[PDB]
Design a protein around this ligand. Sequence first.
Ligand SMILES: *[C@@H]1O[C@H](CO)[C@@H](O)[C@H](O)[C@H]1NC(C)=O
Lengths: 142, 49
Amino acid sequence: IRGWIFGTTLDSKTQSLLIVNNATNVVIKVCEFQFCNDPFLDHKNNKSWMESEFRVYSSANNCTFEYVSQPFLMDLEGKQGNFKNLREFVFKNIDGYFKIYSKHTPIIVREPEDLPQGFSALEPLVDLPIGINITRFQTLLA
Amino acid sequence: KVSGNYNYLYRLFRKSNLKPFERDISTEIYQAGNKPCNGVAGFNCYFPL
Ligand SMILES: *[C@@H]1O[C@H](CO)[C@@H](O)[C@H](O)[C@H]1NC(C)=O
C-alpha cells in the first residue's frame, strides 16, 4: 500500500489530489488528473513487483499544486506473515486546509486481524493549503 | 484597458454555498429547471463564467 487519491468526480472535470510514497520521495500533487479505470501498480512479473505504470493518470492538465518531501520509512522486500509494521493515518479537510496526521508502530504479532487494544495518540504530520472540496477517496497499491 | 480587458472572470451560477478559503473550477454548463439539458448554449443552460 503506497498512496491515495482524493476527489469528488475523478473524471478530469474536477480538481483532484494524489499522494504517493512509492517513489524515492514523498510526492503530493493537487492536479486535474484523469485517472484511468485501472488504478494498479502491482501487476508485474510472476513473483516480483516493479515501479511500472507510473502514468496511471492519462492526462495531467492545467492545474496548480505540487509538493515534494522526504520519504517515510517502510520495510524491505515482501514477506508472508510476521507483520511487525502497523501504520495509522487520519485525513481531515477543515477550514480550507487538508490535514494529514500519521503514526507508525512496529513489532506487533498476533494471529487475528482487526487491530489490538492500544492507546496510541497521533502526532501531526502535515497541513496543506489545497483549497478544494473532496467527496470520494480511493486507495492505491503497488 | 480602454480597448477591452476580458481576462478577469467571475462565477454567478452555482446554486451552492461555500466554506471559507477554497477555489472551484466548474467549467461545465450549469443546468436549471430540473430538465436534462445535455447540450451547449441552450435555453436555461447558461455558461457559468
Ligand atoms: C488551462 O488553460 C487552457 C488554455 O486555454 C484553458 O483552455 C483551460 O480551460 C485552463 N484550465 C484551467 C483549469 O484553468
